[PDB]
């Protein structure tokens, strides 16, 4: 069994599938507790915010999810567990545009936001809660799968070089469509590291950070779009954490914008959600700006037990 903040992803196996029931019964009682905490966060929002028709709609979705989940009887066998997976899959679908509806509701409410820390902490708690819930749910759904090098959602031999390469090719495509070119990426450091890790957090953070590094490079080289400097990624693997540094030669975040980059913009969500995700899983996301030259972004993530 693996662990992250206060959650457990069961790594045990059984011939008779009894491991699926131990995991499903844990999931069955954890999800309503996690969803009730989000309802409490919605009830504690300032009145003027919480009664915004869009924010109110998202609040209602959370009440419907807790209702559908608590109205599901306790899981007695494989047949019960199978139907519980259908409910979980329906909730993941009904809450797909929750972040889109949140930023859209909070944008209208911007005329009443005297303190930006309120919106940051509400979005940090809401976005990390869905990460924890999606990880918990998709791990269980993946315990039925017979994937190679995966115990549920935990990759038994994850290669940080390989996962970075997958998202570099993705970001270079978006970059190439927008600007006609994309900076090449050079990966150095512990390029041969292989270890147990959950890819899902990296699968959100990496494409966002890579998009930012490539956008910055392109925006600071309008003169020569066909010839832009490389983005350098350095991998540092050790017993405590995995460090992935992303360096760009994109001019750097200006002194007057240094605070604004880590806040939610109404959408500029990549950097603040990535930092919330990193902190939620025991890590960090730090920025080092060399104004006039570029930015160095340090992503640290704690290893699995
Ligand atoms: C297949 C998933 C569809 C997706 N389409 C997307 N379009 C963008 N445009 C923002 C952007 C483009 C280029 C640079 Cl350089 C920076 C930012 N992002 N994006 C996704 O993340 C996923």
């Amino acid at each position: 069994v693996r662990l992250t903040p206060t959650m457990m992803l069961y790594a045990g196996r059984s011939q008779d599938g009894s491991h699926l029931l131990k995991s499903a019964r844990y999931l069955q009682q954890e999800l309503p507790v996690r969803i009730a905490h989000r309802i409490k966060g919605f009830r504690c929002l300032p009145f003027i915010i919480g009664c915004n028709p869009t924010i109110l709609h998202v609040h209602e979705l959370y009440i419907r999810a807790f209702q559908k989940l608590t109205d599901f009887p306790p899981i007695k066998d494989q047949a019960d567990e199978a139907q519980y997976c259908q409910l979980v899959r329906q909730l993941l679908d009904d809450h797909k545009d929750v972040v889109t509806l949140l930023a859209e509701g909070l944008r209208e409410s911007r005329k009443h936001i005297e303190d930006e820390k309120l919106v940051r902490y509400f979005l940090d708690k809401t976005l990390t809660s869905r990460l924890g819930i999606r990880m918990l749910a998709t791990h269980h759904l993946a315990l039925h799968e017979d994937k190679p090098d995966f115990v549920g959602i935990i990759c038994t031999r994850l290669s940080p070089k390989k996962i970075i390469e997958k998202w570099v090719d993705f970001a270079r495509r978006l970059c190439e469509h927008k600007y006609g070119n994309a900076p090449r990426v050079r990966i150095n450091g512990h390029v041969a590291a292989r270890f147990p890790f959950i890819p899902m957090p990296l699968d959100y953070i990496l494409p966002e950070l890579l998009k930012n590094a490539m956008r910055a490079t392109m925006e600071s080289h309008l003169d020569t779009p066909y010839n832009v400097p490389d983005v350098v990624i350095t991998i540092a693997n050790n017993d405590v954490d995995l460090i992935i540094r992303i360096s760009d030669r994109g001019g750097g975040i200006a002194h007057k914008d240094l605070d604004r980059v880590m806040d939610y913009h109404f959408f500029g969500f990549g950097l603040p959600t990535s930092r919330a995700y990193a902190e939620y899983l025991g890590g960090s996301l730090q920025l080092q700006s060399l104004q006039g030259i570029g930015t160095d972004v340090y992503l640290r993530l704690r290893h699995i037990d």
Side-chain angles (χ1 to χ4, degrees):
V1 47
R2 317 294 195 166
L3 218 139
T4 334
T6 53
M7 77 182 59
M8 290 225 301
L9 301 190
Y10 289 112
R13 293 295 173 152
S14 187
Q15 344 285 272
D16 65 317
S18 60
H19 64 305
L20 291 160
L21 304 178
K22 178 156 162 275
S23 162
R25 284 186 257 246
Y26 164 75
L27 193 68
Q28 190 182 213
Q29 61 101 228
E30 198 63 36
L31 298 192
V33 167
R34 294 182 181 250
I35 276 173
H37 290 151
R38 284 299 93 225
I39 300 174
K40 195 181 186 77
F42 273 98
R43 291 175 196 233
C44 293
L45 263 175
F47 180 72
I48 197 69
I49 301 172
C51 65
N52 166 251
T54 321
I55 297 294
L56 231 189
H57 175 263
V58 186
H59 183 176
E60 290 191 14
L61 282 183
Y62 275 82
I63 294 164
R64 281 160 209 254
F66 183 91
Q67 256 147 24
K68 290 175 180 294
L69 285 165
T70 62
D71 296 341
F72 198 92
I75 304 175
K76 294 105 58 199
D77 49 41
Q78 172 72 99
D80 272 19
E81 185 263 341
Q83 294 313 133
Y84 188 71
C85 294
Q86 299 298 125
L87 166 60
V88 165
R89 287 188 197 111
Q90 198 194 66
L91 302 183
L92 294 174
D93 191 64
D94 304 344
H95 288 235
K96 63 189 164 193
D97 302 321
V98 150
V99 185
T100 288
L101 288 172
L102 278 181
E104 193 154 343
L106 290 169
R107 183 205 63 241
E108 305 172 21
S109 294
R110 264 289 165 188
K111 38 160 165 33
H112 310 98
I113 301 161
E114 308 287 332
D115 181 45
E116 208 272 338
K117 287 212 313 300
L118 182 133
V119 166
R120 187 148 52 80
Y121 299 149
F122 179 70
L123 286 172
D124 285 344
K125 287 291 278 178
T126 296
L127 278 140
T128 50
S129 162
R130 307 166 90 254
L131 175 70
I133 290 161
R134 175 157 227 107
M135 286 177 64
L136 227 73
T138 52
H139 179 68
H140 185 74
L141 306 184
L143 290 178
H144 296 277
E145 301 165 22
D146 191 338
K147 280 234 290 155
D149 294 351
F150 265 105
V151 178
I153 66 163
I154 305 127
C155 186
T156 68
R157 41 183 308 274
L158 180 122
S159 162
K161 179 195 190 65
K162 244 105 180 299
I163 195 174
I164 293 169
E165 283 175 352
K166 167 176 126 212
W167 294 109
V168 160
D169 184 58
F170 172 85
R172 280 180 105 266
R173 262 154 218 266
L174 302 171
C175 199
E176 236 123 26
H177 179 223
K178 200 177 178 180
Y179 304 103
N181 189 34
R184 277 207 193 277
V185 182
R186 302 198 312 262
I187 312 174
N188 63 50
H190 297 151
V191 294
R194 217 108 191 176
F195 47 82
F197 216 75
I198 305 172
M200 184 174 308
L202 285 171
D203 288 330
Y204 172 80
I205 307 174
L206 297 173
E208 292 312 308
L209 296 180
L210 285 162
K211 274 160 62 185
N212 263 320
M214 295 185 189
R215 202 217 71 107
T217 304
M218 302 310 298
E219 298 284 4
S220 60
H221 287 84
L222 307 177
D223 31 289
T224 59
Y226 45 75
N227 190 14
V228 296
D230 291 351
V231 166
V232 191
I233 301 175
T234 303
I235 306 167
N237 186 43
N238 63 74
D239 291 66
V240 185
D241 58 4
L242 169 67
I243 312 124
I244 298 172
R245 174 186 56 207
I246 303 163
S247 301
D248 63 65
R249 291 243 136 190
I253 296 162
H255 284 106
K256 78 265 196 60
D257 311 327
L258 279 171
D259 293 293
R260 310 208 99 265
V261 289
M262 296 310 304
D263 302 353
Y264 297 85
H265 288 131
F266 315 97
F267 292 101
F269 270 51
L271 281 182
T273 50
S274 285
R275 186 185 52 176
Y277 279 14
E279 288 174 351
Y280 182 62
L281 314 157
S284 51
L285 185 73
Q286 295 163 17
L287 253 283
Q288 283 286 351
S289 185
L290 295 84
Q291 291 88 8
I293 296 300
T295 289
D296 281 54
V297 172
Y298 294 86
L299 177 64
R300 303 177 161 88
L301 288 175
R302 276 225 128 88
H303 275 297
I304 273 175
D305 38 298

